[PDB]
Every structure is written in structure tokens, then in C-alpha cells.
Design a protein around this ligand. Sequence first.
Ligand SMILES: CCCCn1c(=O)n(Cc2ccccc2F)c(=O)c2[nH]c(Cc3ccc(NC(C)=O)cc3)nc21
Ligand SMILES: [Mn+2]
Ligand code: NA
Length: 605
Amino acid sequence: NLSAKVVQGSLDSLPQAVREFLENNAELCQPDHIHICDGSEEENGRLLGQMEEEGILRRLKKYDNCWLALTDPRDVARIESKTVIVTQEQRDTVPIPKTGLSQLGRWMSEEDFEKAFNARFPGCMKGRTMYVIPFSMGPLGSPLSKIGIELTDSPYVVASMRIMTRMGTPVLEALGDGEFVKCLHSVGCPLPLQKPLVNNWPCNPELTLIAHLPDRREIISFGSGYGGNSLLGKKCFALRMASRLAKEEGWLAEHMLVLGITNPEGEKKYLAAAFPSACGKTNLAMMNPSLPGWKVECVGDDIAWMKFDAQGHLRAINPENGFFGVAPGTSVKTNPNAIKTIQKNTIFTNVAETSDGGVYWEGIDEPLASGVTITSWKNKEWSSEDGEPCAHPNSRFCTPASQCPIIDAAWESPEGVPIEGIIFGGRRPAGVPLVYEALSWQHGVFVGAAMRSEAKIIMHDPFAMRPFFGYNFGKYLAHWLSMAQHPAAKLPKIFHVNWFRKDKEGKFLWPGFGENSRVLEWMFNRIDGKASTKLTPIGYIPKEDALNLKGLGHINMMELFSISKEFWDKEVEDIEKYLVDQVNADLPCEIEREILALKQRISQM
Ligand SMILES: CCCCn1c(=O)n(Cc2ccccc2F)c(=O)c2[nH]c(Cc3ccc(NC(C)=O)cc3)nc21
Ligand SMILES: [Mn+2]
Ligand code: NA
């Protein structure tokens, strides 16, 4: 009866709990066929070919095995306003704010979710194939790795999941009869189609809903096929669900790149960094450093799972298998390693296409050859006078991590890499120096808590996790604070960076990019106890002449590193207001103390 629908694999080979998850949802969604993914190259080639037929993907003939998907303009991004966590008690998910609506999460009652679920999923896959994606977050078989099963009616999701996760039969074999996170996804357009189909990309914007049910170990997503909404291992699983598990089991699931940096003497450290959007996070993750003798290597560009080892060192793994990177602004100058990575075996979404089957986007910094023309992401002839970008601002490459020329040798080690420094950062046109260092662990947690960044609007994004907290942010802060009482903890040094400070004409004070190796150099030596410190009210900055400026043009170091009482009076008042308002009864006393200490330090300047 159900075996009759199966077009690849066998129900009898699946572990019982996987079979039952499949059976329950096939009955609910009523797909025409079941395809159990094996993750093989042969399967991938076949789905691409099928997606090419149906106009889902176009071949990019300039490259080896590269493909382009164009979406419905209504479905172009991860959508927070349609994203919820479902728990019995609201407080477990989000703090009750003093005023307004919480910006720290979006809670939906179990009752409300059942209704919303029943209004969407029954019969949602009629006319489509349900794909069964067995995937591992983290190196196959590792202590810190977790496995999920994603059922989807989207072949784009399957092919993207193959890159972004370890996917297929080896995962089922590692899983056996173990636990897994249940992931259910549908584009929400059963056949026959009730509504027009734009660029062969099905979506249901009106009913779009991305839900998390932590107690059930379930992620349920409806109506969007795009990145953060559909690739369920990434944000939904590896950040939201995982951060909750992390708090319960004593580890951390964080929105952090991980890189390894080696000095000219062969000494190597691993660093983690959390940035909000529009900060060049991926660029830093695979930075080509300007300083002679230095090496930078990439562990991951988005997510880090961290746990104390037996000697109290924080060990990170990258739970992803690829990079889901923003395309526009990617060039040989801004990210030479990302450019090499994406030359082959890569899926691009919503970028432009050149007439010779290449890709294009704003800031690609690549002059077109004579007679080459550009088709935009809206399938229109494009010119620079059109007054709209050739690529969507949120357009993507989706690319294997193994292909990064500077992929770290330990990027898949099951034991993880030891983190010696955590870097918080933002885009701040005024007031905030290029780099500073936390005064203590408690102060460091507060620095993460206080993060704000220019999106012409400056908004708060604490730990870069604001859209991603799996649970009460107040409890998340308490969890971070508790790391200082972990026996023999070797706590990472905490820093804050701003690449984006401007002079009064809005010119950037710091050249940045590969020159940010100089800032990493200072952090590196600080971790090693170098007396390169000068104390300020906000933390330590580099002493006079301590930052390595050899080979640079003139830098206005005085403005770059200036700390104004006026600016910081306003800053701390804004930080206090936001944290007391938003975190309310759940704000740890250690953070209250750091807010007041900063105020006192500022008042004395
Ligand atoms: C979302 C787009 C972010 C782009 N981006 C950016 O991505 N990084 C981060 C970064 C890039 C490459 C390597 C490492 C790294 F950390 C910067 O340091 C940076 N500075 C700046 C501002 C800047 C600074 C200087 C200049 N030009 C000149 C001549 O100085 C142009 C722009 N943009 C950066
Ligand atoms: Mn991210
Ligand atoms: Na987005």
C-alpha cells in the first residue's frame, strides 16, 4: 500500500522510528511518491537533470556542474515574522518584556499551533514526491554530531541539503535505532495548482510558517522553499533547537564562524566570531591575510557547536558541510577564497546570469567581455541604468566546504577545535573603536548582550542570535555566565570589533578586509599575554603603537580609537533600556552589575 508509492529505496531497510515518522507524514501529506535519498552522486545528477527539465534549475555552462535557481520574488529570504517556537509555557521560549512585543523570539501556544498545522499540512503534497533526507549535523559519527530526517516535497531542498549537510545512506547507517530530529517541510502547493507558479518556484507566502517544537524534537515548515526556512538543519536545527539542548546539556550552539590563524612562528589558534548581517562574516571566515608570514584557515562560516573537553577547553565543531553565502559583494578582492570555492559543484539562487552561462552580481568586480550581456534574477535583460540590482540582495551561493582552498585540516575532526578567542562585532558608523577586549568573562557576556548594528537604522542583535534563540534569552545569558563556574574552565578571551567606523564625511577610517589580519594579530598576542593593553571605560584597546600599521597608508588612529563620554553616555542608556525592557524578570544579576559598572566607569571620564 505505501511500498507501492516508493520510487527509490525500501521501507524495510529504514530503521523502525524513521519508517514510522515517514508513514505518519506520508498519510498526512498524501504525496504521490516517496523517494528515500541515498546521497549518491548518481542520485544528485538525476535530480538536477529533473529540475532542469521542469525549469527549476538552469545549467551554468561556464562552470563545472554549477546551477541557478530563480525564485518567486515573494519568497526570497528567511522570514522571522513567520517564525515561531511552540512550548507549553511562554517564558520557556521568550522573556515577558516590560513594554511592547518581545524582539527576542516569537512564541506560539501548543493549541494555536495545532490549529495552524491542521489548516496547512493535510493533503499538502498531493501530486508531488516526498523526499526523505537522512542528514548529519557535524562529522558523520562524531560525539558532538546530531542526526535529523527531513521530509520535503522540494528537490531544490534535497540538492541544497546534500551540500549543506552530510546526507544519505551513510547517515541512516550511523543513525541505526538512535534518536533523530523530526523535520517536516512542504512548499504548500499541492497539485493541481490553485495559484499561478512564478519561475517554476512553488511557495505559499500567505500560509508560510516555520515552527519549532523542542519537547517533541520536531521542526515543521510550510510555504517557503528558501534557505533558512527550508534547509532545516541550519537555522531551525543547528541554532534554535540545538541552543536549547545545549543549555540543558551544558554546551553551546552559537551563531559563529570558526577560523584557525597561524603566526609566522608556526603557533596556531582557533577563533570564533559572531556578527549580525552586513558585516562580511563569510569574508572574515576565509580571509586572505595581508600580513606576511600569517596563515588563515576556515573551519566554518556560520554555526559553531562548542563543548568543554576534560581539560576545560571549549571545543568547536562546524555542524554544517558547506557555506550558504550571500553572493553580492563577493569578488576576487573581497573574498578570493570564496571565488575559488564556487567554481564547481555549486548551486546559486537569485543571482544574475551572463550570456556565456556565468554568474553575476553587484560588486563581483569583473568587467564583461565584449558582447557579453546580463540576464537579471527576474529573467529580464539587464543594464546598469535600470535602477535595480541584477541580483537579489539576499541571493546565494550554496557550496561544498571541502572545496575551500583554505579549508582547515581539522574542519571535520570529531574532537573539534579549541577556541581561544570569541569575537563579537557590529557595523557602527560612529563611536565604537576598531577593536576592544572584555575586562572579564562577565563583562564579555555583557558585551555580547549589548551588540547593536546598522542594518539607516541601528538595531540590537545580542550575540548575533536575536532571530535564533531557542529559548528564553535571560536563561541564555545565565547559561553563558555559568561557564565561569565550570571546573578548571579555560575561558576564551572576548573581543569586540567594528570594521565600519567613519569620519564626518562618512569615509571609513580603517581599510579592513585583509588588513583585519592586523587586528587578529593583536588579539592573538593578547591571548598569549602580551602587555599591549591600554585601559578604557569600555574595555582594553591596543596601547599606542601596539597595532601593526606597517604597509598601510595613513590611519587616523586617534579618531578610530576615540571614546567619547557623550557617545557612551547615550550608548549605555540605550543598552540598559533594551536589556531591562526586553529581558525584564529574566535578566541575570551579573548583567545588571555590568550595566551599572559601565555607567560608573563612564561617569568618571
Ligand atoms: C556586507 C559587505 C561588507 C564588506 N566588508 C567586509 O566584508 N569586511 C570584512 C572582511 C572582508 C574581507 C576579509 C576579511 C574581512 F574581515 C571589511 O572589513 C569591510 N570593511 C568595509 C568598509 C570599506 C573600507 C574600505 C574601503 N576602501 C578603501 C580603499 O579603503 C571600502 C569599504 N567593508 C567591508
Ligand atoms: Mn547566519
Ligand atoms: Na535573510
